[PDB]
Amino acid sequence: IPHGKGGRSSVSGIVATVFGATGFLGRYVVNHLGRMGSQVIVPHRCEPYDTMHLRPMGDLGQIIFMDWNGRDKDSIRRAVEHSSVVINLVGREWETQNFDFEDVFVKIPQAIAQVSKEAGVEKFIHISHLNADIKSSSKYLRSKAVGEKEVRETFPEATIIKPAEIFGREDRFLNYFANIRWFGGVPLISLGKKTVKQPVYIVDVTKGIINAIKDPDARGKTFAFVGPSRYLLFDLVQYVFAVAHRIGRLFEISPFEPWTTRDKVERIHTTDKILPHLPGLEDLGVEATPLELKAIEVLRRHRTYRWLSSEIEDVQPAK
Amino acid sequence: MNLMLALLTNFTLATLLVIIAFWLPQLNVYSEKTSPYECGFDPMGSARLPFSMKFFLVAITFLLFDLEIALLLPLPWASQTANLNTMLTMALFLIILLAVSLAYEWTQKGLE
Ligand SMILES: NC(=O)c1ccc[n+]([C@@H]2O[C@H](COP(=O)([O-])OP(=O)(O)OC[C@H]3O[C@@H](n4cnc5c(N)ncnc54)[C@H](OP(=O)(O)O)[C@@H]3O)[C@@H](O)[C@H]2O)c1
């Protein structure tokens, strides 16, 4: 039962759990539950010290850590037994040399869609992506739209989420560009046609969850996440060079965490804007955020001072 | 022919060792945030380097005392001669031409 005011050292009655919640997204959600009060049980896989930069997030005795593997059907059953809502961000990019990647969107999201359903969680949640379509594409982008089919079977109440290409602070989406000091910028694939997607700013997505986290009355009913206006141009790859003015790694260095001459190059140009009829955002709102204004912050390079940026974009068309 | 073998040997250990220190963890997978937090403990510091003179003269002031102690250098080869008086009478001139050039300026060093 909620008490007092939402500042910190308060209650607000919801427990949670957030699986994953180390890399870019999960760190940035829990930080919004280390404020309005919670009990956020964040487990994590292998990382003893990479989770510390998190701890000054909940006040005291709020967030609490466990250890788990995730192919053991017990490790997901020992935590969740006491919970209210449980969201799931788990999963990643490239196929691991260990995890074969095929069912880690299939077996894992179900492996935690095991006793969670049984044990009496509620308002269980999962992630989708705006561009994943069960027609043939894309080797990584596929197996994600299987969860929308395969996993939705279990837990008839989900409110599974479908956002766009997101740009954060430390994010890897818009940062693959501008790391491209290289033989030259070569768009994908050397064509200025279908860029770009709906680049929503990471706050609005992470403010969506906690707006549905007790919504009420969204369960089973899936939503998708609007971008800003409107579609976008090729200039986005020029815009990068317009302003830029041209966990558990190792001790020394790794062996392979590449640019992946594979799905990576073709996952970024898959575009496929999709069904509007999903509610999907202002209903869960109220949030929408632009690009032109919020892309200076995340981009700071070797001038570090000059900006003087006047150049904008129409939409662009198909708009 | 073995000198250059003893020089490019030396640099190539040094010009190696930069990369195996600077570069090797430089591509490591740690965080390394781009935030403008660097340039320690004088956070911003926006100015030109102003001209500050008594910094300057201590350049010039040396450069001239420098020259003649190249002129002064071939004494110990010149101590072997025929008529030597043209040495002692002459050798001792440069020095006193050096030491004079002090005494004048010595009225004003300022804070050196
Ligand atoms: N919504 C979007 O815009 C978007 C964009 C790209 C990708 N995604 C997908 O949506 C989620 C966003 O992930 P992210 O942005 O935070 O990047 P991320 O690097 O994939 O973060 C995932 C974290 O969980 C770990 N992990 C990987 N597989 C795991 C597993 N089976 N079980 C437990 N932990 C696992 C990863 O390594 P450790 O195991 O060492 O912790 C990493 O620490 C991911 O599922 C991602 O594949 C979403």
Distance (Å, whole) CA A236 – CA A315: 11
Distance of CA A174 to the CA centre of its chain: 13
Rounded CA separation A288/A208 (Å): 10
Q: How many helices (H) and strands (E) does chain B have?
A: 3, 0
Three-state SS for A15-53 is CCCEECCCCHHHHHHHHHHCCCCCCCEEEECCCCCCCHH
Query: If DSSP codes are grouped into helix, strand and coil, which group holds residue A90?
Result: coil
Helix axes B53-71, B85-105, angle to 10 degrees: 180
Up-side HSE of residue B50: CA atoms within 13 Å toward CB? 4
Resolution in A: 4.6
Closest to A51 in 3D by CA, of A75, A68, A72: A68
| Domain residue ranges in chain B | 7-107
N- to C-terminal Cα distance for chain A? 46
Taking the Cβ of residue A300 and every Cβ of chain B, the question of whether any pair is shorter than 8 Å is answered with: yes
Q: What is the DSSP letter of B22?
A: I
Amino acid at B54: K
Contact A36, A210 (CB under 8 A): yes
Q: Which residues pair with A224 in a beta bridge?
A: A162
- Per DSSP, the three-state class of A212 is helix
CATH superfamily of B7-107: NADH:ubiquinone/plastoquinone oxidoreductase, chain 3 (1.20.58.1610)
Question: Is the CB of residue A310 less than 8 Å away from at least one CB of chain B?
Answer: no
Q: What does the DSSP 8-state code read for residue B21?
A: I
Residue B59, exposed/middle/buried by CB under 10 A (0-12, 13-18, 19+)? exposed
Q: How was this structure determined?
A: cryo-EM
The H or E element that residue A238 is part of is helix A235-243
Could you tell which of A46, A90, A108 is best to mutate to test the pocket of ligand 1, judged by most ligand atoms within 8 Å of the CB?
Answer: A90
Q: Nearest-CA neighbor of A129 among A274, A318, A288? A: A274
Full DSSP string of A241-266:
HHHS------SS--S-----TTHHHH
Instruction: Say yes or no: CB of residue A23 within 6 Å of ligand 1.
Output: yes
Asked if A268 and B49 count as a contact pair (C-beta separation under 8 A), the reply is no
Which residues from A are below 8 Å from B34, CB to CB? 300-301
* A253 part of contact set with chain B, CB < 8 Å: yes
Rounded CA separation A294/A200 (Å): 10
Sequence letter at residue A39: Q
Residue in A17, A19, A25 to alter for ligand 1 test, most ligand atoms within 8 A of Cβ: A25
Peptide bond between residue A216 and the one before it cis (omega within 30 degrees of 0)? yes
Residue A120, classed as helix, strand or coil, is coil
Segment 35-54 of chain B within 8 Å of chain A by CB: 35-36
